[PDB]
Amino acid sequence: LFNSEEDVVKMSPLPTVENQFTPTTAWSTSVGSGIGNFYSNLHPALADNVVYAADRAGLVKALNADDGKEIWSVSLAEKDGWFSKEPALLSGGVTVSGGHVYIGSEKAQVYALNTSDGTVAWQTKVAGEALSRPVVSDGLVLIHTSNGQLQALNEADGAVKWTVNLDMPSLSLRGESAPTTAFGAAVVGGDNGRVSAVLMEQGQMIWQQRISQATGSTEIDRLSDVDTTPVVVNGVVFALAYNGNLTALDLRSGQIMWKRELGSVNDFIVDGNRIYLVDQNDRVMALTIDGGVTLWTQSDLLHRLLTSPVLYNGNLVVGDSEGYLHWINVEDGRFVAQQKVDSSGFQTEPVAADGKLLIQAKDGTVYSITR
Amino acid sequence: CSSDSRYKRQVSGDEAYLEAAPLAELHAPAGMILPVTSGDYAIPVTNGSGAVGKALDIR
Amino acid sequence: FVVKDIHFEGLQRVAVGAALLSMPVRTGDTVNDEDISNTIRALFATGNFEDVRVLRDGDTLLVQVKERPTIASITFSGNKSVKDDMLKQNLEASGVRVGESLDRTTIADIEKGLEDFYYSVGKYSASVKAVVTPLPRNRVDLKLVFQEGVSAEIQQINIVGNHAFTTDELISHFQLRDEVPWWNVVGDRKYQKQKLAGDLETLRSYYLDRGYARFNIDSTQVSLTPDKKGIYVTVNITEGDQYKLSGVEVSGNLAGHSAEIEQLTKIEPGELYNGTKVTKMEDDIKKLLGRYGYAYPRVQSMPEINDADKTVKLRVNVDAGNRFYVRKIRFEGNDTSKDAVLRREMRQMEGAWLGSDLVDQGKERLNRLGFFETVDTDTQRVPGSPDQVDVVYKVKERNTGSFNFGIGYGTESGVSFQAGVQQDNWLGTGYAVGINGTKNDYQTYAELSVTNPYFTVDGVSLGGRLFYNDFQADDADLSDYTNKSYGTDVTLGFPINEYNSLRAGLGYVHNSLSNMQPQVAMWRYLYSMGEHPSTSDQDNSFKTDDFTFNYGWTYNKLDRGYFPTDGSRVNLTGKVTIPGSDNEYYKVTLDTATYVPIDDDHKWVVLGRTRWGYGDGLGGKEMPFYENFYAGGSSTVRGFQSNTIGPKAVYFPHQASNYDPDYDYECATQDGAKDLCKSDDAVGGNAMAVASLEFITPTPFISDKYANSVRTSFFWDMGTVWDTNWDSSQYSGYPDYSDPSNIRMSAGIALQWMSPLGPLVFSYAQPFKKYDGDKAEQFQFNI
Amino acid sequence: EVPDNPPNEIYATAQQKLQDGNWRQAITQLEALDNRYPFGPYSQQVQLDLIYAYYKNADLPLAQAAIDRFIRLNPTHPNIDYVMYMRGLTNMALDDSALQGFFGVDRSDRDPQHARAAFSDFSKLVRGYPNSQYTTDATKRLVFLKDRLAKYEYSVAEYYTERGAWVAVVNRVEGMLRDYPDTQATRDALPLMENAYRQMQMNAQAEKVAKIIAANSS
Amino acid sequence: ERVVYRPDINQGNYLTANDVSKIRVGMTQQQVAYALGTPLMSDPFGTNTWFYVFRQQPGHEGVTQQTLTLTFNSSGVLTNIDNKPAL
C-alpha cells in the first residue's frame, strides 16, 4: 500500500532518555486546541495563582495555578465585520499585566482581557498582526507586529502611544523581535538581521546595528526562528540576527561587545555567565558571556524540535514539539528527568511562575509540570 | 533480411535546382519603366570551379 | 631575469601560445617578479586552469598548470520532481555545463543556487551537493546529489486591513487552496508565489468591479515559518469604499465613429464602479476601430473617481490609426502545401482597410482547417505609411494518414483481409482521400471517398465516393445471403452562410442478392416489396437497383478543425428516393457533438454526442433492411460488441439453406435448431436514438509535449434502436422492438493516443445495462 | 559515442564510416573526435566532414549548426565557400520535399522559406567566393530558384485573380515585376495585372502592360 | 445566376469624400500623403498616380466600385484627382 509514495529526508530524534530525577505533571488542565500545531505566537502567561489559559478558537480560561480548576472562563471568538463568527485566532500571546490580559489576535486586534473575567477591558486594532506577543509595559503595549511595527498603546485603554516600523525584513521572516524596554529605550532585535534600540518614550531609534544575514541573496536557515527579543544585560544587549548569529552589543550605541556570529542560535538565555541556548541543530549548549565560549553542550536533543531552555526544579527543563519534556543537567547536558506528559508537542516557553511550571501544549493543552 | 535496403533508404528526395530554369528577360517599352529587379535577386554569374549538379566538387 | 623558455605543464584544451599570450610574460619578454605572479593570475584568468604554478629556473620560467576544462559530464541524483536540465539551467546560469571549465570554487555556490532555486520552487527542504568526479587529462564528471525533503504548501492567508470582503470567498477567488478532505475529497494544494501575483489581482479586480476605486493593497507578508513549509500570509490592504461610474467623458481622435464609440460608452451613470468592463469597453472601441481600419486605436481612459459624492467620472482619450492598414499579408509555415490553400481560408483582402475580425475568422477558418498544428500570425506593421501592415500568417501544419484494421484471418488461414486508409490533404493539396475495402471469402469489398474540397473557389467540395462489394457470407460460394452491391456517390459542398452549409447528393446502389436467410422482418420487407420467396430455403435471390437523392446541411462553430475542444456544430444529413428507384423510401438522420468547457482552461469540457436516424418507405413501400440502425461495441457505444443495439429478428421455420452447412450456419434450418429459431444480433429498426456523453480529462503523468495530443475521457454509453413497424405478433414470444425502452447502457474511458500517423483510439468500456440480444467485448480499440 | 581515444583512431573511423556510407556512424566518430578533441587539427576538416556526414545523414539543421560551427570555429577560411554553399544547399533541401515527384507534382508554389534562405547563401557564396569550388552548381540553383520564388509569387498572383481582389492581384504581380526580370511566370502574370487594371479601370495602365506584353511577346 | 446567395466580394484602398477634400490638385505628394498617406497602388511605369480604388460585390446583384486615382506630376505636385465610379 504505502511502500511507494516515500520521499523524506531525515530529522534527528531524541536520544538519551534519562530520569535521574523522576518527573511528573503538577496537574493537567487542557483548554482545547490551543497553541496548535498550527504555527502561532499565542502563548499562555502564568500569574496571580491563575492559569490564564487560552486558545485561538476563543476560549479564554482562567484555571487555578494549584490544580488547574476554572477561575473564570469566557469564549471570545470573533463575531463579524466582513465575515461572521471567526475564532479568536490569537497572534500575540497571553500577556497578563494588571487587571488585563493583553492578547494580540491575528485580526491585528490586541485586547485587554479583564483578569477577573477575561472580558475585553479594552480592544485596539494594531498595525498588522502581532509577530511578537505584546510586551505590555511602561504604559505601552509594545508589539513587534508582522510588518515589524512597534506599537505602543495606553495599556489602560489601548490608546496608541505610537506605531513605528522596526527592522523590517522582505516578508514575514518569522522571528519574534519582542520589544524589551531597557533603560528608557525599547530595545528590539530584528527579523531583517539587524538589532536596534528604539525609544521607550516615543519610539525614536536609539540606534540600529546589523548583526548578520536575513533571507534574500544570503539565503540563511529557516529553522532559526530567532530570539530577537533582546536581553540587555544592563550595558550589553544580547540578541540575535535573523539567521541566529548571536552577538553581544552596547545598549546606548549597539557597538558589538562580542559575537557568536557562527552560532545560529534558535533559543537562548543569558543564564548568568553560562549562556544556555538552543543550537541550530536544536541542541543545547552552555556558553560564556565573553565570546560565547562553550561552557558545556548537549546533543541529546539533536534536531528534536525543542522549546526554550528553562531552569525549574534545579535542572535545565525543556520541552520539544513531540510532547516530551527534558530535564537537562545545568551541568554538561544530561537528562536528569524526561517526561512525555503529551504527544501533541510543545513550543511554548515554559513558564516557571506561581511556583509551578505551566505550559500549553499544542492541542494536548495546558499542562503544569513538576518533578 | 531481404535485399532492398535491409533497414534503410530509398527515401524521397529532390534534385531539380541544378537544372537552372531558362528565364527569358522581361522587356519594357518606353514609358513602361519600373525597376524590374529588386530584393535578393542578384546572381553573380561565376562558373568558377566545380560543375553543374553533383559534378561540383564534394568533400 | 629574462626567460629563455616558459614551460607550460599541462593545458589539455587551450593552446600553447594561447596560454602564453594570456601570460603577461612571453618566452623572451622582460620578466618581473610581479609578472611571474601576474602569470599565476592571468593563467587563472584563462578560466580553464585549475591550479597554476608559475615558477622559474633562475629565469627560465616553469609553469605547473592544473586544469579546469571540459567537464566530462554532469550527473544528477535525487531529482525526484525537478528536471535536471532545470538544475543544469542553474548550472548554465552559473556558466557551467558539460564540456566546460570546472572551477572548484563555485561548487557550493551552485549548491546554494539550486537550493536558492529550490527556494524559488515552493520548497526549501531540498539540498544539493555537487560532487566533482575527474576523468582523463582535465576532465570531470559533476555528480549532483539532491536530498529533497519536502516542499512548502498553502497554509494560511490573513488579510488584515480587509474590511469589505470575506477572505473565504476571496480564497475561493484565489487558487491558494488548502483543503482536500478525506470523506469530502475535493480540490488541491501546494503553493507557488507565481499564483500569488495573479491571485493578488484576483483580489484587486474583485474589489475594482464592485466600486472599490479607493481599494489598494498596503502590503503582503508571507510567513518564512520554519519546518520550511509553513506559509501563513499577512496581507495588508486598504479596502477602499465603493464608487459610482457616473459618466464617460470620452473624446480624442474618435475618427467620425463617435456615436459608435458612444454605443461602447453606453453606461449607467451612478452604477457601482467597475474598471474591468471599463477596461473592456476601451478594447471594444479598439476592435471597433480595428474593424474600422485602425490597428493602433490608442484608447486611454481616465477614471475621475470623485470621492466627494463617492463616484467616478470617465475621461477616455482616443487616438485611432489610419484606415487602409492591410497593405498585404504573408503566410509562413507552409513548406508542404500550397499558399492559396491557406489563403482561401481568410476573410481580409490585400489592398484594403483593416477589418480586425476578418483575420480572426480567417484564422478561425484555419482553426477549422484541421491539417494544422498552430493557428497564429504575425501582423507585421510595415514601417512608413499608416497603411502598411503586412500580416505574416505564421502557422504550423500537421500530418495526415491513418490505416484501419480488424483482428485476424490472414497469414495463417487463407488470403483474406480488412483494409481502410486515409489521405486527407493529399500531398499538400487539400484533397481528402479516404479509401477502404475488404476481400475475404465472405465478401470482396472496395470503397473510395475522394474530395476536391475547393473544386471551385467557394469551396465546391467535389466529394466523390464509390463502392463495389462482392459480398457472399458464403457457405461454399453462395448458400447463405450472397449479395453483390455496387455504386457511387458524388456529393458537393455549398456555401450557405459562413457557418451554414448545405449538402446534396445522389445514390446509385445495385444490390444483387441471392440465397437469403429466412428472417421474418427482413422478408417482411420483401413482402413489403411484393416479393414472397421460399421461407424454408435459402435459394432466394433479389436484384434491386435503388436510386436515391441524398442531402443534408451543416452548421459549424467548432474551433479546432483537428483537436476540437470548444464550440458547437450541426450535422444534418439525409436521403430520399426518386422515381426510377427499385424501392421508394427515405432515411433521415442527425448527429450531435457539444463542447462546453467545465474548466474554462478546457481541461474539463462537456462532450455530449448523440446520433439520430429514421428511415421508412415513402408510402406503399418500406426502407430496405440493410438501411437499419446499429450501435453498441467498439464505437460511440462500446463495451458491447459491434451490431448489438437494435431489433432482433427470427428465422422462418426452415429446412436446407441450399447447402445449409452440416450443423453450421443455423437459420432454423434442417441442420438443427429448426422451426422459427431467432437470431439475437442487432438487426436494427426504422428508428435510431443513440447517444454518448464524454468528459474531457487531462493526463498529469504524461509529458505535455505529447499529453496535449492525448485526450482522456470517461464516458457513459447508452442508446436505443427500435422499429416502429416491428409487430409483437410474430415477435410475441420473441422480443418486440417497437419500444423506446430498448435502451442499453455502458460506461468507461477512451484512450486517444496520437501516433505519427494519427490518433489511436483505445477503450476498455463496461456495458452496465444490456438490453436484449447484446454481446459484449470490454476492451475495445478503434484503430 | 567513441571515448577519449587516439584522435586519428577516432578520425579514421569517422572517415571509414564516411567511406562506409554509415553516416549515422560517421557522425558517431566525427563528433566524438570533436567531443574529446574539438581543438584537433583536422577537427575543422571534421567540421566539413560533419557537414558532409550530416547532409548525407539528412541532418540539415545539424549540418547548419556545423556550418555555423565552421562559421564560428573558422570565421575566416577558404572552406567557408563550402559552408556558404552547404548552408544554402541545406536551405535548398530544407525547403520542400515530398513523394509526389513520380506523379509529376512540384512544390515551387509551396512556401519558399528556406528557398529564400537558399537564394541568400548560394548568392553569398557566389558573391563571397565567386571563384571557389562551389560557384558553378550554386549559380544553377540560384537561376532555378529565381523562378521558384517567382512561381511561388505566381501562385499568389494567380490566386488573387480568381479571388478578384484586384489590388491584391497587381501588387503580387508588381512584386513579381519589381523582383524578377526574366521569369516566364512574371511574363504570364503580366496580363493578370493588366486584366485587374482593366477590372480597376486602369486599362490605360493595362495598355502599358499590353505594350510590355507586346515587348514580352518575344 | 439562378442562385441569389453569394458570399460578399470586397476590396478597399479607396478614398472617402472627406479624403478628396483633404487634398487638391496642386498639393504635393507629401501634402497628399499627410492627408491620405500612400495608396496601396501607385504608378510604377509613368508619373506619380496614386490609385485608391474601392471594389465590392455582395449578393448576385452586381458589383460596386469607387476608383480614385491621384495623378500628380513628376514633381509629385497634384495634377489630377481622377475619381472613377463603378461600371
Listing DSSP states for C410-457 in one string gives TTTSSS---EEEEESSTTSS--EEEEEE-B-SSEE--EEEEEETTSST
**In Å, how far is E31's CA from the nearest CA of chain C?**
13
* In this structure, CATH architecture of domain C326-397: Roll (3.10)
Pick the CATH number of C474-481+493-645+677-782 from 3.50.50.60, 3.30.70.3340, 1.10.238.10, 2.40.160.50: 2.40.160.50
Rounded CA separation A88/D51 (Å)? 74
Rounded CA separation C468/C3 (Å)? 96
Rounded CA separation D52/C470 (Å)? 55
Number of independent structural domains in chain A: 1
Beta-ladder partners of C313: C304
Rounded CA separation C261/C284 (Å)? 8
Cβ–Cβ gap E7/C385 under 8 Å? no
Question: What is the CB neighbour count within 10 angstroms for residue D120?
Answer: 17
Residues of C with CB below 8 A from D95's CB? 335
* 3-state DSSP assignment of residue A18: coil
Least CB–CB distance from E11: residue in C322, C351, C458: C351
In total, the C-beta contacts within 8 angstroms joining chain C to chain D are 76
Rounded CA separation E45/C67 (Å)? 69
Q: Is C353's Cβ below 8 Å from some Cβ in E?
A: yes
In total, the C-beta contacts within 8 angstroms joining chain A to chain C are 86
Contact C561, C569 (CB under 8 A): no
**CB-based contacts of C166-174 (< 8 A; 24+ apart in sequence):** C166/A82, C166/A83, C167/A82, C167/A83, C168/A83, C170/C203, C170/C206, C173/C199, C173/C202, C173/C203, C173/C206, C174/C199, C174/C202, C174/C203
Residues of D with CB below 8 A from B41's CB? 119, 146, 179-181
Question: Closest Cα to residue D84, out of D41, D50, D135?
Answer: D135
**In Å, how far is C501's CA from the nearest CA of chain E?**
12
3-state per-residue secondary structure call for chain D: CCCCCCHHHHHHHHHHHHHCCCHHHHHHHHHHHHHHCCCCCCHHHHHHHHHHHHHHCCCHHHHHHHHHHHHHHCCCCCCHHHHHHHHHHHHHHHHCCCCCCCCCCCCCCECCHHHHHHHHHHHHHHHHCCCCCCHHHHHHHHHHHHHHHHHHHHHHHHHHHHHCCHHHHHHHHHHHHHHCCCCHHHHHHHHHHHHHHHHCCCHHHHHHHHHHHHHCCC
* 3-state DSSP assignment of residue A79: coil
Rounded CA separation A199/E36 (Å)? 72
Beta-ladder partners of C765: C748
Question: Closest Cα to residue A177, out of A205, A203, A146, A155?
Answer: A146
Listing DSSP states for B10-49 in one string gives ------GGGG----PPP---TT-------TT--------S
Phi-psi region of B39 (alpha: psi -120 to 50; beta: other; left: phi over 0): left
Residues of C with CB below 8 A from E40's CB? 324, 327, 350-352, 387
Strands C567-577 and C586-599: antiparallel
Q: Which three cell numbers stand for residue E78?
A: 497634384
Rounded CA separation C544/C55 (Å)? 107
Please tell me what DSSP assigns to residue B55.
G
Q: Which of C292, C346, C349, C354 to mutate: most E Cβ within 10 Å? A: C349
Question: Closest Cα to residue C23, out of C9, C6, C10, C11?
Answer: C6
Q: Is B27 exposed, middle or buried, given 0-12, 13-18 or 19+ CB atoms closer than 10 A?
A: middle
Q: Which three cell numbers stand for residue A81?
A: 465585520
Would you tell me the crossing angle of helices D80-95 and D43-56 to the nearest 10 degrees? 20
* 3-state DSSP assignment of residue C295: coil
Q: How many helices (H) and strands (E) does chain E have?
A: 2, 4
Rounded CA separation E61/E1 (Å)? 10
Please tell me what DSSP assigns to residue A349.
P
Rounded CA separation A226/C346 (Å)? 66
Contact C401, C758 (CB under 8 A): yes
H or E stretch including E20? helix E17-21
Least CB–CB distance from D182: residue in B23, B32, B55: B23
Please tell me what DSSP assigns to residue A9.
-
Listing DSSP states for C560-594 in one string gives -SSS--SEEEEEEEEEEE-BTBSS-BEEEEEEEEE
Query: Domain span at residue A359?
Result: 1-371
Question: Closest Cα to residue C223, out of C281, C176, C270, C293?
Answer: C176
Indicate the CATH number for domain C7-66: 3.10.20.310
φ and ψ at residue A109, rounded to 5 degrees: -100, 130
Touching status, chains D and E (3+ beta-carbon pairs under 8 Å): yes
Rounded CA separation C390/C328 (Å)? 5
Rounded CA separation C163/C165 (Å)? 6
* 3-state DSSP assignment of residue A43: coil
Q: Is C506 exposed, middle or buried, given 0-12, 13-18 or 19+ CB atoms closer than 10 A?
A: middle
3-state per-residue secondary structure call for C39-70: HHHHHHCCCCCCEEEEEEECCEEEEEEECCCC
Contact C447, C460 (CB under 8 A): no
Beta-ladder partners of C404: C420
Cβ–Cβ gap D177/E43 under 8 Å? no
Sequence ranges of the domains in chain D? 1-74
Listing DSSP states for C313-380 in one string gives EEEEEEE---S--EEEEEEES-SSSBHHHHHTS----SSS---HHHHHHHHHHHHTTSSEEEE--EEE
For residue E23, what are the contacts with CB-CB under 8 A and spacing of at least 6?
E31, E32, E35, E36, E70, E78, E81
Please tell me what DSSP assigns to residue B53.
G
| Planar angle of CA C211, C213, C218, nearest 5 degrees | 125
Alpha-carbon torsion, ordered A259, A265, A269, A270, to 10 deg: -10
Q: Is E63's Cβ below 8 Å from some Cβ in C?
A: no
For residue A113, what are the contacts with CB-CB under 8 A and spacing of at least 6?
A60, A74, A76, A100, A101, A102, A103, A119, A120, A121
Residues of E with CB below 8 A from C387's CB? 13, 37-40
Amino acid at C163: H
- What's the alpha-carbon Rg for chain C, to the nearest Å? 38
* 3-state DSSP assignment of residue B58: coil
Contact D102, B10 (CB under 8 A): no
Rounded CA separation C474/C515 (Å)? 10
Rounded CA separation C287/C309 (Å)? 33
Beta-ladder partners of C692: C609, C717
Cβ–Cβ gap C336/D96 under 8 Å? yes
Question: Closest Cα to residue A360, out of A48, A60, A101, A53?
Answer: A53
φ and ψ at residue D150, rounded to 5 degrees: -70, -40
Q: Is E38's Cβ below 8 Å from some Cβ in C?
A: yes
Rounded CA separation B50/A130 (Å)? 84
Amino acid at A320: D
In total, the C-beta contacts within 8 angstroms joining chain B to chain E are 8
Please tell me what DSSP assigns to residue C12.
S
Q: Gaps after which residues in chain C, C–N over 2.5 Å? A: none
Domain C153-238 has CATH 3.90.550.10: no
Contact C204, C212 (CB under 8 A): no
**CB-based contacts of C431-435 (< 8 A; 24+ apart in sequence):** C432/C463
Residues in chain C, total: 783
Rounded CA separation D137/A243 (Å)? 71
Cβ–Cβ gap E44/B34 under 8 Å? yes
Least CB–CB distance from B48: residue in D97, D101, D135: D135
Listing DSSP states for A180-220 in one string gives EEETTEEE---TTSEEEEEETTT--EEEEEE-S--SSSS--
Sequence ranges of the domains in chain E? 9-84
φ and ψ at residue E71, rounded to 5 degrees: -90, 110
φ and ψ at residue A316, rounded to 5 degrees: -75, 100
Alpha-carbon torsion, ordered A211, A217, A222, A224, to 10 deg: -10
Question: Closest Cα to residue A121, out of A74, A157, A91, A78?
Answer: A157
Q: Which three cell numbers stand for residue C126?
A: 531540498
Cβ–Cβ gap D205/E45 under 8 Å? yes
- What's the alpha-carbon Rg for chain D, to the nearest Å? 23
Cβ–Cβ gap B31/E46 under 8 Å? yes
**In Å, how far is E31's CA from the nearest CA of chain D?**
24
- What's the alpha-carbon Rg for chain E, to the nearest Å? 15
State the fold for domain C244-319: Ubiquitin-like (UB roll) (3.10.20)
Cβ–Cβ gap E37/C385 under 8 Å? yes
Q: Is C620's Cβ below 8 Å from some Cβ in D?
A: no
Q: Is E44's Cβ below 8 Å from some Cβ in B?
A: yes
Q: Is E45's Cβ below 8 Å from some Cβ in C?
A: no
How many angstroms separate the Cα of C225 from the Cα of each of A72, A211, A267, C737? 34, 21, 15, 70
Q: Is C119's Cβ below 8 Å from some Cβ in A?
A: yes
Cβ–Cβ gap D109/C99 under 8 Å? no
- What's the alpha-carbon Rg for chain A, to the nearest Å? 20
Least CB–CB distance from C336: residue in D110, D155, D168: D110
Q: Is D160's Cβ below 8 Å from some Cβ in C?
A: yes
Least CB–CB distance from C224: residue in A38, A129, A173: A173
Question: Closest Cα to residue A26, out of A70, A64, A73?
Answer: A64
- In units of Å, what resolution does this entry have? 9.8
Sign of the CA dihedral with C280 first, then C284, C285, and C287 last: positive
Strands C482-495 and C462-471: antiparallel
Q: Which residue in chain B is spatially nearest to E43 when comparing CA positions? A: B34
For residue C755, what are the contacts with CB-CB under 8 A and spacing of at least 6?
none
Q: How many helices (H) and strands (E) does chain C have?
A: 11, 33
Q: Is C313's Cβ below 8 Å from some Cβ in A?
A: no
User: Count of alpha carbons within 13 Å of C551, Cβ hemisphere only?
Assistant: 8
Rounded CA separation A16/C369 (Å)? 74
Contact A371, A21 (CB under 8 A): yes
Q: Which three cell numbers stand for residue A243?
A: 539567521
How many angstroms separate the Cα of C432 from the Cα of each of C484, C548, C557, C559? 27, 24, 21, 20
Strands C244-253 and C312-319: parallel
Q: Please, which residues 27-46 of chain E have a Cβ atom closer than 8 Å to chain D? A: 40-41, 43-46
Q: Which three cell numbers stand for residue C35?
A: 609578472
Burial C146-158 (b: 16+ CB within 10 A, else e): bebbebbebbbbb
- Which chains neighbour E (Cβ–Cβ under 8 Å, 3 or more pairs)? B, C, D
- Which chains neighbour B (Cβ–Cβ under 8 Å, 3 or more pairs)? D, E
Q: Is C446 exposed, middle or buried, given 0-12, 13-18 or 19+ CB atoms closer than 10 A?
A: middle
- What's the alpha-carbon Rg for chain B, to the nearest Å? 21
φ and ψ at residue C712, rounded to 5 degrees: -90, 135
Q: Which three cell numbers stand for residue C560?
A: 479546432
Touching status, chains C and D (3+ beta-carbon pairs under 8 Å): yes
Least CB–CB distance from E11: residue in D165, D177, D201: D165
Please tell me what DSSP assigns to residue C400.
-
3-state per-residue secondary structure call for C603-641: CEEEEEEEEEEECCECCCCCCCHHHCCCCCCCCCCCCCC
Q: Which three cell numbers stand for residue D179?
A: 523582383
Residue with cell 422499429: C723
Residues in chain D whose Cβ is within 8 Å of chain E? 164-168, 170-171, 174, 177-178, 199-202, 205, 208
Pick the CATH number of C71-151 from 3.90.79.10, 3.30.160.20, 3.90.550.10, 3.10.20.310: 3.10.20.310
Q: Please, which residues 50-79 of chain E have a Cβ atom closer than 8 Å to chain D? A: 51, 53, 55, 57, 65, 67, 69
- Which chains neighbour C (Cβ–Cβ under 8 Å, 3 or more pairs)? A, D, E
Alpha-carbon torsion, ordered A16, A18, A24, A25, to 10 deg: -20
Least CB–CB distance from D167: residue in E41, E57, E84: E41
Q: Is C327's Cβ below 8 Å from some Cβ in E?
A: yes
Residues of C with CB below 8 A from D155's CB? 338-340
Q: Is C549 exposed, middle or buried, given 0-12, 13-18 or 19+ CB atoms closer than 10 A?
A: middle
